[PDB]
Amino acid sequence: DSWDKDVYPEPPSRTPAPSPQTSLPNPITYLTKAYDLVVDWPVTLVREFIERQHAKNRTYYYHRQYRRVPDITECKEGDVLCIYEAEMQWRRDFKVDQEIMNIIQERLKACQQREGENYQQNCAKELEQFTKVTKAYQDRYLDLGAYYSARKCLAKQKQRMLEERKAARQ
Amino acid sequence: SGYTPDEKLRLQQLRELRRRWLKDQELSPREPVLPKNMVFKAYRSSLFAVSHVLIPMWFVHYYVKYHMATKPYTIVSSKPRIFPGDTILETGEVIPPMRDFPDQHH
Amino acid sequence: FENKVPEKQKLFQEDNGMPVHLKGGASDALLYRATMALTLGGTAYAIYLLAMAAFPK
Amino acid sequence: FHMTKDMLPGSYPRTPEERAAAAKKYNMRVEDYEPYPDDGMGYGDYPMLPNRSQHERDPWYQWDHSELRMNWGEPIHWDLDMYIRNRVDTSPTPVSWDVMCKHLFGFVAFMVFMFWVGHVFPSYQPVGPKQYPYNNLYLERGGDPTKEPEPVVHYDI
Amino acid sequence: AFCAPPAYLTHQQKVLRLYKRALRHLESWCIHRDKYRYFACLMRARFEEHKNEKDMMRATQLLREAEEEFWQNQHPQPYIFPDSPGGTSFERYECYKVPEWCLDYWHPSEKAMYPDYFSKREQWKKLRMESWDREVKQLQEETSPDGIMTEALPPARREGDLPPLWWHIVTRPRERPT
Amino acid sequence: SKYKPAPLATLPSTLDPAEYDVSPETRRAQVERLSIRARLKREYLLQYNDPKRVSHIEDPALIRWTYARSANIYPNFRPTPKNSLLGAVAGFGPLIFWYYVFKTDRDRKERLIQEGKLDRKFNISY
Amino acid sequence: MNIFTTSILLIFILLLSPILISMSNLIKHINFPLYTTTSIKFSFIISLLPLLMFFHNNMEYMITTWHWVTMNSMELKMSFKTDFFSILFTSVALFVTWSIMQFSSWYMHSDPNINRFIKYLTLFLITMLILTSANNMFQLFIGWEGVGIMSFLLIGWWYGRTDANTAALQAILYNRIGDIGFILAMVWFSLNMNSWELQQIMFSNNNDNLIPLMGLLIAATGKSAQFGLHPWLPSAMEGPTPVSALLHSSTMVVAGIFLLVRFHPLTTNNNFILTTMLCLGALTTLFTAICALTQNDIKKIIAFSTSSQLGLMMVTLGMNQPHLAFLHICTHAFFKAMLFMCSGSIIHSLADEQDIRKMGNITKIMPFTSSCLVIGSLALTGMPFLTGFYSKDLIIEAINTCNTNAWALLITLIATSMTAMYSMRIIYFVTMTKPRFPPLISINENDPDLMNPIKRLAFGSIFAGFVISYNIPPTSIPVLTMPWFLKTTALIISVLGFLIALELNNLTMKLSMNKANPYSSFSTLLGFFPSIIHRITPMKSLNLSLKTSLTLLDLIWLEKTIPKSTSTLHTNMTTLTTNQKGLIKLYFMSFLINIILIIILYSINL
Ligand SMILES: CCCCCCCCCCCCCCCCCC(=O)OC[C@H](COP(=O)(O)OCCN)OC(=O)CCCCCCCCCCCCCCCCC
Numbered sequence A: 001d002s003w004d005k006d007v008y009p010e011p012p013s014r015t016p017a018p019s020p021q022t023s024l025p026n027p028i029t030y031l032t033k034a035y036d037l038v039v040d041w042p043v044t045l046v047r048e049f050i051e052r053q054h055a056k057n058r059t060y061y062y063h064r065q066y067r068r069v070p071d072i073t074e075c076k077e078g079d080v081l082c083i084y085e086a087e088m089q090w091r092r093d094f095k096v097d098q099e100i101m102n103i104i105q106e107r108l109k110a111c112q113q114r115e116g117e118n119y120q121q122n123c124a125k126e127l128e129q130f131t132k133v134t135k136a137y138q139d140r141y142l143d144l145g146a147y148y149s150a151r152k153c154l155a156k157q158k159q160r161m162l163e164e165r166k167a168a169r170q
Numbered sequence B: 001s002g003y004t005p006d007e008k009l010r011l012q013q014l015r016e017l018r019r020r021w022l023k024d025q026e027l028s029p030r031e032p033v034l035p036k037n038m039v040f041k042a043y044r045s046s047l048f049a050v051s052h053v054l055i056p057m058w059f060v061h062y063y064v065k066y067h068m069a070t071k072p073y074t075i076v077s078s079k080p081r082i083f084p085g086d087t088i089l090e091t092g093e094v095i096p097p098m099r100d101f102p103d104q105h106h
Numbered sequence C: 001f002e003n004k005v006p007e008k009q010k011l012f013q014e015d016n017g018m019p020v021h022l023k024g025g026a027s028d029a030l031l032y033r034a035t036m037a038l039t040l041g042g043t044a045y046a047i048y049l050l051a052m053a054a055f056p057k
Numbered sequence D: 001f002h003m004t005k006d007m008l009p010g011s012y013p014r015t016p017e018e019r020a021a022a023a024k025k026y027n028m029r030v031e032d033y034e035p036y037p038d039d040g041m042g043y044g045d046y047p048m049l050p051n052r053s054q055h056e057r058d059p060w061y062q063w064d065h066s067e068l069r070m071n072w073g074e075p076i077h078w079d080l081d082m083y084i085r086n087r088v089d090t091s092p093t094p095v096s097w098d099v100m101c102k103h104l105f106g107f108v109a110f111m112v113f114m115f116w117v118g119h120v121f122p123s124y125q126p127v128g129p130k131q132y133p134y135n136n137l138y139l140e141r142g143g144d145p146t147k148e149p150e151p152v153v154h155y156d157i
Numbered sequence E: 001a002f003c004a005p006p007a008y009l010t011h012q013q014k015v016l017r018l019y020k021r022a023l024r025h026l027e028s029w030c031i032h033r034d035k036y037r038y039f040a041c042l043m044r045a046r047f048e049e050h051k052n053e054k055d056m057m058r059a060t061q062l063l064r065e066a067e068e069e070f071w072q073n074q075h076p077q078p079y080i081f082p083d084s085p086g087g088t089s090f091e092r093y094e095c096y097k098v099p100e101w102c103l104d105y106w107h108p109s110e111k112a113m114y115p116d117y118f119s120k121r122e123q124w125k126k127l128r129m130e131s132w133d134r135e136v137k138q139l140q141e142e143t144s145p146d147g148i149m150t151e152a153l154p155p156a157r158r159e160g161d162l163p164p165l166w167w168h169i170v171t172r173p174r175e176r177p178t
Numbered sequence F: 001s002k003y004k005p006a007p008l009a010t011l012p013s014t015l016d017p018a019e020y021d022v023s024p025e026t027r028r029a030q031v032e033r034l035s036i037r038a039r040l041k042r043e044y045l046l047q048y049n050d051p052k053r054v055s056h057i058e059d060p061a062l063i064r065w066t067y068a069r070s071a072n073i074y075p076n077f078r079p080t081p082k083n084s085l086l087g088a089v090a091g092f093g094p095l096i097f098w099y100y101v102f103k104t105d106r107d108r109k110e111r112l113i114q115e116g117k118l119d120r121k122f123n124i125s126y
Numbered sequence G: 001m002n003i004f005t006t007s008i009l010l011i012f013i014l015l016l017s018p019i020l021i022s023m024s025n026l027i028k029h030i031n032f033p034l035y036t037t038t039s040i041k042f043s044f045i046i047s048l049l050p051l052l053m054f055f056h057n058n059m060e061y062m063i064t065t066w067h068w069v070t071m072n073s074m075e076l077k078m079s080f081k082t083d084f085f086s087i088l089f090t091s092v093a094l095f096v097t098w099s100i101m102q103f104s105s106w107y108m109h110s111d112p113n114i115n116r117f118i119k120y121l122t123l124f125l126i127t128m129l130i131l132t133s134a135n136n137m138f139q140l141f142i143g144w145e146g147v148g149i150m151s152f153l154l155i156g157w158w159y160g161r162t163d164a165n166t167a168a169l170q171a172i173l174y175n176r177i178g179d180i181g182f183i184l185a186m187v188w189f190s191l192n193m194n195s196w197e198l199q200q201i202m203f204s205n206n207n208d209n210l211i212p213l214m215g216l217l218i219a220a221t222g223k224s225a226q227f228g229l230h231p232w233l234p235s236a237m238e239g240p241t242p243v244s245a246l247l248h249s250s251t252m253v254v255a256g257i258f259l260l261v262r263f264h265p266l267t268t269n270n271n272f273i274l275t276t277m278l279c280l281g282a283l284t285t286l287f288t289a290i291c292a293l294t295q296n297d298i299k300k301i302i303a304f305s306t307s308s309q310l311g312l313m314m315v316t317l318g319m320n321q322p323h324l325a326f327l328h329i330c331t332h333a334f335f336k337a338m339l340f341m342c343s344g345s346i347i348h349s350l351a352d353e354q355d356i357r358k359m360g361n362i363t364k365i366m367p368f369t370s371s372c373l374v375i376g377s378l379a380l381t382g383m384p385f386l387t388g389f390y391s392k393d394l395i396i397e398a399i400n401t402c403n404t405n406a407w408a409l410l411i412t413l414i415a416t417s418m419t420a421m422y423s424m425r426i427i428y429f430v431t432m433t434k435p436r437f438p439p440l441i442s443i444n445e446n447d448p449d450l451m452n453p454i455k456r457l458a459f460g461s462i463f464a465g466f467v468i469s470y471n472i473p474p475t476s477i478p479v480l481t482m483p484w485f486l487k488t489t490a491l492i493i494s495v496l497g498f499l500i501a502l503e504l505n506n507l508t509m510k511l512s513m514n515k516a517n518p519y520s521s522f523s524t525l526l527g528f529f530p531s532i533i534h535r536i537t538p539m540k541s542l543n544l545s546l547k548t549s550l551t552l553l554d555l556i557w558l559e560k561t562i563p564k565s566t567s568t569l570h571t572n573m574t575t576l577t578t579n580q581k582g583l584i585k586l587y588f589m590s591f592l593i594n595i596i597l598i599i600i601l602y603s604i605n606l
C-alpha cells in the first residue's frame, strides 16, 4: 500500500466474533472459502510472480521539489521576469491547495461512509476541519475570476486586511 | 355498385401476375449457397462458468485487491454491528451486557 | 320545474325482464347493492354484538 | 431540375390573370386558389390551404408520399412541418374542445380545492408526540458536547 | 385500398358507410355477442323502416340527423382491428418491407448466394421493359383528349399484353415479409 | 347537445352542413378536382414505373414549398405598422424583461455579499 | 471485503460481455439470445451472493473503481454506493430481466433483428444497474440518460410506425423535463457542497434545500410519470411487449422514486416537500386508476395500473417511509413483469389482438396463463400473505395512522378500491365469459421458453415479499395498536371493489344499452389531458417558432435592420454621388464653390 494513515486517517476495525446460534451451515462462509481456494490463490500466485519480476527489474523515481523564489510582494511592477517567477510559484501553490482540498473532501467522504448513521456525531472533528479549510480557501482564493493571478490574490488579501483593520478600529 | 368491367378484367390480370411474382419469391432446395455435446449440466453449463465467469473473476479480483486496496479510500465500509455480549476479534474485549429488563410481560 | 313524467314513464314499460326495483338504470342498482351489503353487514355486526354481550369478558 | 421563375413561387397576385397564372402554377383551380392576405408577412402567392393536419387524409388510400399522406404535385400546406403525423393533430374528437377544456380545468381545480380543504382539515391519530430520550437525542443529532442543552425531561404515564 | 375513391360519395354509399360505422360502434359498446346481435337487428330494422323514402330531401335530412346521432352516441374508444389504421399492429412491418430495387445494388457475392432467384428476377425485368414500352403506347392511346378523367387504369386489351403501370402493384413487398 | 369544433379539433366532413346542401356547381368543382388529381397521379405513376429512370423523381411541390418557406419571404415582405410592432416587441421585450430580472437578482446578491447577510456555506468552486 | 466488490464488478462485467460479443463478429456462429439469457442468470446468482452477505452483516459499501478527472477541489471519480437499495434492486432487476429475456426469446421469433433487440435490452439493463448502483450524481445522470435513450430506441423499435416514433419522442420530452429538474438539483449541489457525492449530501442535510429538493421532485415526477407528466407511459406501451414489461413495468418507472429514496435523508427535513409529494402521489394514483377503469386495451390497463401503484409509492415517499416504498418497488416489479408477460402470451397466441373486447373463455382455453394472471391480479390487489401483502398493506396502515392530508387519504383508499375494480375488469373481460376472438384457434402455450419464466415469476410473486420482508433489517418502526376499521381497511376496500366491479360487469352482461355519461367519457379519453395538452402545447410552440423566430426575426427584421439597410443606404448614396451630368460647366462650378468654402473655413479657423 502506497498510502499512509498520517494523511489518510482510519480508525482500527472492530469486528465482532461470530456466534452461530442456529445449527444450519453458513453458505457465506462456504462460498468464501471455496472462492478463496479457486480465485484468490491463482491471483496471488501470479501477483507474486509479477512482483518478483519487478524486484528483478527495480527502478526508482523521485518527487521533484522547487525552491522558494521571492514572492510577488517584493516584485517590482512592470519587471516581468520576477513577476513571471512569482506567478508560476503562485500557480503551483494554487494547484497544491486544490489537491489539499481534495484530500480533505476525501477524508470527509470516508468519515461519512464509515460512520453511516452515526455521522452526525462521530464526524464532528472532520466536519470542523472541512469547515476551517473551506473558510481559509474562500478567504484566499474565491472570486478571483477566470484569469486568477497572484496580483489579484494580493489585491483581495490587501482589501481584506484594510476592511478588517477598519473593523478593528471600533 | 360492383366492379366495372374495365377494373374487373384489370384486377384479375394484376392478381394473376401477383401469383407469378410470389411463386418466384420461393427458394430452390439449394438456397442459400453458403460458402462432444454431452449433456447440459456436464458440458453446456460447465465451460461457460469456467470461461465467462471464472476468468473474469480472476481479472476482477486482481484489480480489486492490487489496484483498489492499495489506494487509500477506494473500498470503505460502515462499521459492523456491535451488540452487548459480543467479543471483538481485532482488539479482544467483551462488550458488557444490558440492564435487568424490569418488564417481562411478553 | 317542467313535465318529464311521460318521458319517465316509457323508461318503465320495457319488456326486457328487468324487474321494477332495478328498472331505473344503474344508480338504483348501486343503491340496491349498497343497502344489501349494509343491512347484512349491520346484521352480522348486531349478532356479533349480542354474542359479545351474552358471553362476557 | 429545369426549374424557372415562372413556375417558382413569386409575388402577391393582383390581377385576375395573375391569380389564374398562380393557380395554374400551383396546380389548383382558380376558384379554389386563395393566397394569404397582403399584410406583408412574406407569404406571397402561396395558397391558403385549409388548416387541417394530415390525419384527416384517407388512410386507406395509396398516397404517393405514404408517410405524409399526400399525393404528387398537389400543393403543400405552409405548415406541413407542423401538421405531419408525428406532430400536431387537428382531428375531430368524440367530445367538443370546449367541453374537454372545461372538464380538465374543473377536475384540476376541484382536486386543488379539496387538497387545500384536507390541508386545513388534516387527519391524524389521537396520540401525543413521539417520545425520545437523551434531550430528544441531543448528542446523536450533532449537538455540541461542550454546550449543555436545556434538559428535555420526559415522564411516565 | 385497391380501388381509387370517386369524385363524390353517392347517397347510397354514404348510407352504407354510416350503417357499417354504426354497427362497428354498436359492437364496441355492446361487447357481448348476443347483446350485439340483438341491437344490430334493431339498427337494421331502423334502417329498413327508413329505407323506402321517396322525397330524397327528407332522406338527406334523415342522413344528417343519423350522422348527428351517431357522433353523439359513438364510442370514445371503438374497436379497431390490429391491421386497420390506428390499430396496434398497423404499419408494424413497414420497417421490414424493403423495396425490390436494392437487389440490383446487391454485391456479386450475394448475387451468387441466390442464383435461380436472380435469374427469375432478370427475366421479370426483361418482361417489364417490353411491357413498359407497350403499355406506354396503350396509355397514350386510351387517354381522352378532353373531358373527365378518373384515377382508374385500363386493362390489357390484346393477347401478350400486360396492364399499364403494373410494376408497383405486382412487385410490392409482402405484408408479412418476415 | 351539439358538437362544437375547434381549429385543433376540426368539424367532421360527415357533419358539416356544406355537404347536405350540395349544388351542381360544387359537384362539378369536385369533378375537376378529381380530374387534376388523376392527371397528377398518372404523371407520377408513369415517372415512377419507367424502368429507364435512374434517379429520384423530382417534386415541384416540394421545390415550391421549400422556396416559399426559405427564400421568398424577404422579396415578399413589406413593412407595415403591425409587423413592425410585432418584430419590435418580439426582439426587445424578452431581452428587457430578462435584463430586469437578472439585474434585480444580481443586485440583491451583490448587496447581500457586501453587507454580509448571505452566508456562503461551502462555495469554494464557483 | 474483496469477494463483495468482486461480485459487484463481476455483475457489471457479465452484463458488459454480450455487447462485446455482439461487436466481436461471432453472433452468426453462436446463439445470442440463449447466451445472453445464461449471462443474466449467472449475473443473478452473483447478485444473490451479496444479497446473502448484506442479509448477514448489514454492511454499507462504497467502491471507487476508477478515477475519471480532477479539477481543483472537484474530483469526479467513478464510484458505486452499494447499499441495501442497490443490492436488493440489482437482484430483483436481474431476476426480472432473466424472465423477460427468456420470454422475449420465445416471443420475438420470426424477427431478423432479434439479436439487436436482445443487445438493446442488455444495454438498458447495464444503464439501469448503473443508475441504481451509482454513488455520485454524475454517474446517476449517466444511468438516467442511458435508461432514457434505451427506452426511446425500444419504444421506437418498429421504426416504420409513426405512432411508435411519436410515442418515443414524447417519452423523450417528458423525461427531458425531468432531466431539467435533475440538472437543477445537480447544479445546486455542486454549487453549494462542491461535489455530487452522496456523503457530502448527507453533510448537506442540515440547511434549507428547497431548490434542490424541488428539482429532485420534478425529476422524479418526469421519470415516474406522475400527474402533469403522465401520458408518456401509456404512449410507451406502443412498442413490443417484453419492452413494455421490462422497461415500463419494473425498472424505468421506479427510477425517480428510487432517486427520492436515495435523497430521503434530505427529504425528511422538509415538510413542504413531504406534503407536496403526498398530494402529487395521491392525485396521480387517483387519476390513473380513473383512466384504468374504462381503458380497454389490456396493455393500457396494466400500464395505468403501474402508474397508479407508482402514485402509491410516491405517497409512501410522501410520508417518512422510504424503505416501504422500496419494498413496494420490488413487489411491483415482480407483479407487473408477471402480468405483462402473461398478457403478452395472450396477445401472441391471439395473433396481435390487444383489446379485451375480443377475448374471453381464457380460463378454459389457457389454464396456465389464466392461473398466473389470476395470481398476479390477486397479488396486485393485496390478497393477504402474498408478495404484495408485505408492502401495500403497510402503506395503507401508515396512511391510515399517521398525520397527513385528509383528501389524500380518502383518494388513496378510493384508488386502492378502484385498483381492485380494474383488476376485476381485467379478470372478467379476459378470463371469464364467452369467447369473442376470431374462430381460427392458434393457441399453443406449451413452449418451454414461454412456460418457465412465468413459473419463476409466479414463485417470485408468491414468496418474494415474504422472504424479503422477513430479511429486512428493522427500520422505520410501524405502528400496530389500532382499531379494526383501520387495520383491515385494505382487505375491506379490495373486497368491495371486486364485488362492485363484478356487479357492474354483470350489468354490462345484462341486455340493455345505457346513455354514455361525461364521467365515463372523461375516464376513457384519459382525462382529456393527452388530447388537450398534446394539441395546445406543440401547436403554440411550433407556431411561435415559425411565425415569430425564423420568419419574423431572421428572414424579415434582422435582415431588414442590419445588412439590407446598410446596402440600401450605400446604394442610394452612391446613386446620389454618381448621378453626375458630365458637364464641365457644372464641374467647374463645383470647383469654384469648393474654393470659396476653403477660403471661408480658413478665414474662420484663422
Ligand atoms: C395539484 C397540482 C397539479 C399540477 C399540474 C401541473 C401540470 C404541469 C404540466 C407540465 C407540462 C406541460 C406541457 C407538456 C407538453 C407535452 C407535449 C407532448 O407530449 O406532445 C406530444 C404530441 C403527440 O402526442 P399525442 O398526439 O398525444 O400521441 C400520439 C397519438 N397519435 O406532439 C408531438 O409529438 C409534437 C412534436 C413536438 C413538438 C415540439 C414541442 C416543444 C415543447 C417545448 C416546451 C418548452 C417549455 C417547457 C416548460 C416545462 C415546464 C415544466
Ligand SMILES: CCCCCCCCCCCCCCCCCC(=O)OC[C@H](COP(=O)(O)OCCN)OC(=O)CCCCCCCCCCCCCCCCC
Binding pocket: G562, G563, G564, G566, G567, G568, G570, G571
Ligand atoms: C445587435 C448588434 C447591433 C450592432 C452591430 C451591427 C453591425 C453588424 C455587422 C454589419 C454587417 C453588414 C453587412 C453588409 C453586407 C450585406 C449587404 C449586401 O451584401 O448587399 C448587397 C448589395 C449589392 O447587391 P448585388 O450583389 O450587387 O446584387 C444582387 C445580385 N447581383 O450591396 C449594396 O447594395 C451595397 C453594399 C455596401 C457595402 C456593405 C459592407 C460595407 C459597409 C460599410 C459601412 C460603413 C459605416 C460607416 C460609414 C461612415 C459613418 C456614417
